[PDB]
Paper text:
Anti-phage systems of the BREX (BacteRiophage EXclusion) superfamily rely on site-specific epigenetic DNA methylation to discriminate between the host and invading DNA. We demonstrate that in Type I BREX systems, defense and methylation require BREX site DNA binding by the BrxX (PglX) methyltransferase employing S-adenosyl methionine as a cofactor. We show that BrxX contains MTD and TRD homologous to those of Type IIL R-M enzymes, and, in addition, contains NTD, CTD, and insertion loop in the MTD specific to BrxX proteins. We show that BrxX alone does not methylate DNA, and BREX activity requires an assembly of a supramolecular BrxBCXZ immune complex.
Ocr inhibits BREX defense by binding BrxX in vivo. 57% of the extracted particles yielded a 2.8 Å global resolution map (BrxX:Ocr) corresponding to a BrxX2:Ocr2 complex where two individual BrxX monomers interact with a dimer of Ocr via their TRDs and CTDs. The two BrxX monomers are oriented at an angle of 125° relative to each other; however, the complex displays imperfect symmetry due to the local flexibility of the individual components resulting in varied local resolution. We resolved one monomer to ~2.8 Å clearly defining all structural features except for a flexible loop between residues 395 and 420. The map resolution for the second BrxX monomer stretched from ~3.4 Å around the core of the particle to ~4–6 Å at the periphery; hence, we rigid-body fitted the first monomer model into the density of the second monomer (see “Methods”). Ocr is highly negatively charged, and its interaction with BrxX is largely driven by electrostatic contacts with the positively charged groove on the lower half of the BrxX monomer. To form direct contacts, Ocr utilizes two pairs of tyrosine and glutamic acid residues that form hydrogen bonds with four residues of BrxX TRD: T821, N823, T768, and the main-chain carbonyl of G721. Three out of four of these TRD residues are also directly involved in DNA recognition or binding: N823 directly interacts with the A4 in the target strand of the recognition site, while the main-chain amide of G721 interacts with the phosphate backbone of T5′ base in the non-target strand. Ocr is additionally stabilized by the BrxX CTD via a salt bridge between Ocr E67 and BrxX R1145; the latter residue also interacts with the DNA away from the recognition site. The DNA mimic protein Ocr exploits this non-specific DNA recognition property to sequester BrxX (Stage VI).
Numbering used by the authors:
A (entry chain A): 1 to 406, 431 to 1205
B (entry chain C), C (entry chain D): 1 to 117
């Protein structure tokens, strides 16, 4: 509400301000078009009356208006419009705050009339306000009081008089001399219909009682522009606009107490401020050498006037207020006059800088308000202020130093040249110290020329002061820096900024916050304190390894607090992880850093933990982090782990990156089921056209993930034309190990046999020619808990690459080889029990005998035995070595998971765990059996031999196989087309052959029991149970309803058996084998399958006509319904026959090399789910 | 609120009772007049609460596939299709066993005719 | 089984994870090439158990009226229509937030050039 009011009022207020400014400019004669070209109106005056639109401005205002045009020559129209709008908004906010605080000379509110809305309190108190502000015009104002009118700029005249009165001690916002905005006063702005009444009414009274409203106006009022500019990358326009945010006060206090308060306490132990601190952290133990060095370098005592504080990003100014409060407390401890303390603090105790003029003005206003509320001699004398910075430098010469009444000339020219392109470079511009003191004397000369001399001397001094002041401020060599660098994202990467970073230090040129940290270190004197906060993503990246090494080589840590995530109440901030740290400039090799881990804690809980000071790990050195490569400074890691990390050798150049392709993977990579086996390399040697490839997928250990095929004809000449990378064309076709570069969940390594290729996604490791180490030992080590934890710790981002794997330690043993061999054998045995692997041999339910339930129980027992054996082997291999040293508990449940299809948790999701897995799984098994049955009917599999039987192209050579005797126990179809209906009219009905298959496999003694078991098993999960029906009807319903979906899901939208369907009513459905499709298939389907069906429908239609007529009665509703059923089917089948004839007249020839994805769309609206496979809607001729 | 437990058996029992009420009130005497008597009996049986409709389809006793292609509404709302499926199933079930009530009412009215006096 | 408590939020989370995995695996570096990725992510996310579908349709987050008339299947089954509705809802919701992942992946992969070494 209170905070949301400013947010909801900022956009319309800003729009109204901009519209008023542009309207007043156009009425004056300054107009801007879409292109931005100036449209200055002609300055043709008839004489003593300017011919403007509707206003008659005085001639004296004509030159000043020209200055605005001059501004148009030097700055954009939008820039000046925004500046004027901000100036007016700031002035109105300041006067409203002053009148609400009731600290005026006359104590009367100006804009708001108490107990009288939309009026002014000064209207009744005209003489008192007049004599308080402008006595010389009091009587004339009294005359206006006699008129009871003139609500025009006369009120604005009184406001300007009040501003001139306040200019005596507040010169940075209100100016006694005539300003440029006085010419551009909005028309009828004093009227009750203007925006002033809206400002008065919208802003309540309660929200003025807060002290952070300055930050609210700083941030919320500009949030609309930040949202507008977040869409596109900014280059040099919105550098300060997009870097505005509020900083919580408690972290500011914590940093301040550990930066200056800690230094103040360490300067002399006799400081009684020990009980005055709450966030101070006392070091516990240090080596005597560093203690002696600190005692030697620490002075006995220093004066309280030597404190130097720098705030490169003051922002709202809360840090300035906190520093002022701390300094006031210190001076009160020392003992000084309560009135001169603010003066001396503002003189030589508090300093700050920024990039935005608005932030500087707001900070100055807040500081002056605090001084007024604290000091009583202020606002009557005046004092210089240091808030603004990085102002533009004018190139006018021969006039600024002409009135100077003249070594310093060269320095002045140099500092004038430096401040030209200052907005882009921010606060990173530095000035050598040697030219500081004399420059300061130059400033004093300006103070000697500020009031001495005529108006020209004063103007020259005012023009020359700000740059000298900024240079002196930035060249103070402060001893304490407390600031939070802004956050730079994708928009922060600029070409000119990158060039400047390259010109500057390139070690940490990736991000701006690192450069800010480096500059703050540079601008800090010896034995200084630097307390800062930043994001977490600076200690776990390869780029910052050199930065971390430099930091640990030249400086030392003092106190680091891991704020972590869950900050600011978890509002926005997709990356809210952050850390705070305090660094001493002195180098301490054997220091004892102290770390506090407040991660994953809410703000209230984090504050409670900080107050209680728990979870402290002061049990690490500073050089110990150098042991682990990359210096990943961590506090939870024990010293034993660090010591043992370097005691073992790591993998050398045995890791090799995979090959790369530049695109068009759709024409190279295809799945193995959809190509001929003659061209396959793994099966049927003789032609090298297709080769296995490795890419890496989900989590899987020791074996698996064999499902992709690449084209490598003639060592590669087709893809050599592109020549993407062809990386390492020497280590191919060799056994070794493979692992996934992608994140997934964890880290795992799998065996890789001969005749394989590896891609970028899956990187490969090969043993040397005669290396002592063995591949099986490496596989055993890489799947261990220790290596998993090390990999997780080194790269939390989960981006395992070649450079991050060449440092993992490896051990040497002998039992690990046989353990790895047994694990690989078990994994391969588990992987080779499904149809999706090219080593499938036989189903697991037909190799037993007896009853179907007995076979299912045997299968379940076999799976359980495999699972138990692998669990025991994993436990043994974990307990065999375990480094025979210290170890930690299971980091995650993922690191202690067994990856097998037998393990139901890994198969049916690790989250859900219910008893329904005892049913669903069962159903699945039965489904697979049915699929195998079809494989026997189509000729792909046989009950005599093992493995694939026929998978060639064009249905050529099948006659030879049939005559030889491959299919003798269970004969296969000859046409290659399997009909699928709801009647036994055809001899190729799938249900009948399924029954025959079951009877052949399990005899003819308990066929009914087996059929009942199958039907009951299917209805558990696959389909919905019905009221009453036989087993055969359930089988037929499953085949006609829930078989196409399961097959299409198993092969992942690359079907092998294509489905031809008639349409809405299932009048005609057929399955066609892809590998047995010649150019004379459609004609046979039309000839011997469709026409007899039409004849049967016609012969059955008329017979039921007489049946309904005879004995018509209560059954007439039950009857004749089939008569309605057969009417639609006949017409649908006739239309399908017409389409089939049209397509069969054209002899279509297909090629398996193209792939299912393209070949599936060459038959129009004859197949099923054309869009779900090809991706585009089918085209109808 | 969003949780309910209504089965198809409750709907069938309600439809049966309403059919008996209709055949008693309207004095149905011929088989061909039963159609409308059944139709109205179905109309005040399909629930309008979406939770009840979704719970009914997951119960036991109702299939998940239409039998007549002429009873599918031409709309874009999924509630209408489910309601039409329930209506068709109820119509089939009620017409399956409906002559019993008709002949019972006929024999009762014949008994209490009292020689048309 | 019948007492299944599956909500639209779980389906959306699974689809989001699958989309992230697919975009990481395929390494797509353009805005207009995300159609295939989102199609693949949405296809392999809808459930197949009828009880799960009926529990999802009664959850919070998914409406009951189609927005496009071209996505209506032409069949006599009711599971297909519900699955198509869920697929369309998931597609819209995921396409609502899709540029963030692409730009994040691009800016992350930009920092691994190694100066072509
Ligand atoms: Mg055949």
């Amino acid at each position: 509400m209170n905070t949301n009011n400013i947010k909801k009022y900022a956009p319309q207020a800003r729009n109204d301000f901009r519209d008023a400014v542009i309207q007043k400019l156009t009425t004056l004669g300054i107009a801007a078009d879409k292109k931005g070209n100036l449209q200055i109106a002609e300055a043709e005056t008839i004489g003593e009356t300017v011919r403007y639109g509707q206003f008659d401005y005085p001639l004296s205002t004509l030159p000043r208006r020209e200055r605005l045009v001059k501004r148009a020559r030097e700055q954009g129209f939008e820039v000046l419009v925004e500046h004027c709008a901000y100036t007016w908004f700031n002035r109105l906010c300041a006067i409203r705050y002053m009148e609400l605080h009731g600290y005026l000379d006359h104590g009367f509110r100006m804009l708001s009339h108490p107990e009288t809305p939309t009026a002014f309190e000064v209207l009744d108190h005209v003489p008192e306000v007049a004599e308080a502000l402008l006595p010389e015009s009091k009587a004339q104002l009294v005359e206006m009081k006699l008129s009871g009118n003139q609500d025009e700029a006369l009120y604005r005249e009184l406001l300007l008089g009040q501003c001139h009165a306040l200019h005596h001690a507040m010169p940075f916002l209100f100016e006694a001399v005539d300003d440029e905005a006085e010419l551009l006063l909005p028309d009828n702005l004093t009227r009750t219909d203007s925006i002033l009444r809206g400002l008065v009414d919208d802003i309540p009274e309660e929200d003025w009682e807060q002290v952070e409203v300055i930050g609210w106006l700083y941030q919320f009022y500009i949030s609309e522009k930040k949202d507008a500019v977040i869409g596109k990358v900014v280059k040099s326009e919105d550098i300060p606009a997009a870097t505005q945010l509020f900083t919580p006060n408690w972290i500011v206090q914590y940093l301040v107490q550990n930066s200056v308060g800690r230094q103040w306490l360490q300067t002399y132990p006799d400081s009684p401020l020990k009980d005055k601190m709450e966030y101070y952290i006392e070091p516990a133990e240090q080596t005597p050498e560093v203690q002696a060095q600190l005692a030697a370098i620490t002075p006995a005592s220093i004066e309280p006037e030597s404190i130097k504080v720098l705030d490169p990003a003051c922002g709202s100014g809360h840090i300035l207020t906190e520093a002022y409060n701390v300094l006031k407390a210190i001076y009160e401890e020392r003992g000084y006059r309560t009135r001169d303390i603010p003066q001396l603090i503002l003189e030589n105790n508090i300093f700050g800088l920024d990039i935005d003029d608005r932030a500087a003005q707001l900070s100055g206003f807040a500081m002056l308000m605090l001084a007024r509320q604290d000091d009583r001699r202020i606002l009557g004398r005046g004092v210089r202020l240091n808030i603004v910075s990085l102002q533009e430098s004018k190139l006018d010469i021969a006039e600024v130093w002409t009135k100077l009444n003249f070594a310093e000339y060269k320095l002045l020219m140099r500092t004038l040249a430096l401040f030209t392109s200052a907005k882009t470079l921010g606060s990173l511009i530095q000035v050598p110290q040697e030219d500081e003191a004399a420059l300061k004397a130059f400033l004093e000369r300006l103070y000697r020329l500020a009031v001495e001399g005529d108006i020209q001397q004063k103007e020259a001094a005012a023009e020359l002061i700000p740059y000298i002041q900024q240079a002196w401020i930035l060249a103070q060599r402060y001893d304490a820096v407390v600031a939070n660098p802004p956050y730079m994202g994708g928009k922060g990467m600029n070409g000119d900024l990158k060039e400047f970073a390259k010109k500057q230090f390139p070690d940490s040129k990736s991000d701006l916050f690192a450069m800010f940290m480096q500059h703050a270190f540079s601008l800090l004197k010896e034995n200084g304190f630097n307390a800062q906060v930043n994001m977490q993503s600076w200690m776990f990246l390869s780029s910052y390894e050199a930065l971390r090494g430099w930091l640990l080589d030249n400086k030392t840590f003092i106190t680091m607090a891991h704020l972590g995530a869950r900050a600011f109440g978890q509002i926005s901030g997709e990356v809210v992880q952050t850390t705070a740290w305090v660094i001493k400039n002195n180098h301490s090799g054997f220091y004892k850093p102290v770390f506090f881990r407040l991660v994953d804690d809410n703000e209230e809980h984090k504050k409670n933990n900080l107050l209680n000071r728990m979870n402290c790990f002061k049990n690490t050195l500073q050089n110990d982090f150098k042991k682990i490569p990359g210096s990943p400074i961590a506090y939870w890691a024990t010293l034993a782990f660090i010591n043992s990390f370097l005691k073992l050798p790591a993998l050398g150049t045995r890791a090799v990156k995979g090959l790369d392709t530049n695109g068009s993977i759709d024409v190279f990579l295809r799945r193995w089921p959809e190509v001929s086996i003659n061209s396959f390399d793994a099966l049927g040697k003789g032609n090298s056209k297709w080769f296995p490839i490795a890419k890496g997928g989900e989590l899987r250990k020791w074996f698996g993930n064999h499902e992709y095929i690449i084209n490598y004809e003639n060592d590669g000449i087709e893809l050599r034309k592109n020549k993407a990378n062809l990386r390492n064309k020497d280590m191919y076709f060799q056994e070794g190990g493979t692992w996934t570069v992608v994140s997934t969940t964890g880290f795992s390594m799998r065996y890789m046999p001969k005749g394989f290729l590896f891609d970028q996604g899956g990187s490969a490791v090969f043993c040397e020619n005669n290396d002592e180490l063995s591949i099986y030992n490496i596989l055993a080590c890489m799947n261990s808990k220790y290596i998993n934890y090390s990999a997780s710790l080194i790269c939390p981002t989960l981006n395992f690459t070649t450079g991050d794997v060449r440092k993992f330690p490896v051990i040497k043993n002998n039992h690990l080889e046989d353990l790895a061999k047994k694990a690989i054998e078990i994994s391969k045995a588990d992987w080779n029990q499904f149809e999706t692997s090219w080593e499938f041999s036989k189903n697991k339910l037909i190799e037993h005998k007896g009853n179907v339930a007995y076979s299912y129980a045997s299968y379940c027992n076999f799976q359980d035995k495999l699972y138990e054996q692998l669990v025991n082997i994993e436990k043994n291999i974990n307990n065999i070595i375990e480094e025979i040293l210290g170890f930690k508990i299971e980091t995650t449940e993922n690191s202690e998971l067994i990856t097998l299809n037998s393990n139901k948790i890994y198969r049916y999701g690790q989250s859900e765990t219910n008893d329904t897995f005892l049913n669903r799984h069962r159903s699945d098994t039965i489904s697979e059996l049915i699929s195998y049955s079809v494989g026997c009917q189509m000729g792909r599999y046989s009950l005599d031999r093992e493995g694939l039987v026929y998978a060639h192209e064009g249905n050529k050579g099948f006659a030879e196989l049939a005559a030889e005797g491959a299919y003798k126990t269970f004969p296969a179809d000859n046409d290659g087309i399997l009909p699928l209906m709801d009647d036994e009219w055809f001899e190729d009905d799938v249900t009948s052959r399924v029954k025959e298959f079951v009877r052949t496999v399990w005899g003819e003694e308990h066929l009914q029991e087996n059929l009942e078991f199958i039907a009951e098993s299917l209805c558990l999960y696959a389909i919905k149970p019905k009221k009453g029906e036989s087993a055969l009807e359930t089988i037929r319903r499953y085949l006609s309803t829930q078989f196409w979906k399961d097959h299409m899901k198993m092969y992942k939208k690359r079907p092998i058996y294509w489905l031809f369907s008639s349409g809405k009513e299932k009048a005609f459905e057929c399955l066609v084998y892809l590998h047995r499709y010649n150019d004379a298939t459609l004609s046979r389907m039309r000839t011997e399958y469709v026409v007899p069906l039409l004849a049967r429908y016609q012969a059955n239609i008329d017979r039921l006509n007489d049946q309904l007529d005879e004995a018509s009665g209560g059954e007439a509703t039950r009857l004749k319904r089939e008569r309605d059923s057969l009417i639609k089917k006949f017409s649908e089948l006739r239309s399908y026959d017409d389409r089939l004839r049209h397509y069969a007249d054209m002899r279509i020839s297909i090629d398996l090399d193209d792939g299912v994805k393209v070949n599936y769309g060459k038959f129009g609206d004859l197949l099923a789910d054309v869009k779900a496979i090809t991706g585009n809607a089918p085209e109808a001729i | 609120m969003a949780m309910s437990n209504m089965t198809y058996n409750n709907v069938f029992d309600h439809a049966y009772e309403m059919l008996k009420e209709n055949i008693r009130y309207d004095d149905i005497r011929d088989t061909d007049d039963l159609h409308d008597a059944i139709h109205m009996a179905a109309d005040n049986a399909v629930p309008h609460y979406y939770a009840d409709i979704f719970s009914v389809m997951a119960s036991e006793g109702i299939d998940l596939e239409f039998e007549d292609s002429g009873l599918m509404p031409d709309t874009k709302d999924v509630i209408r299709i489910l309601q039409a499926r329930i209506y068709e199933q109820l119509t089939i079930d009620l017409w399956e066993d409906a002559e019993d009530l008709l002949n019972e009412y006929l024999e009762e009215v014949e008994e209490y005719e009292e020689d048309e006096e």
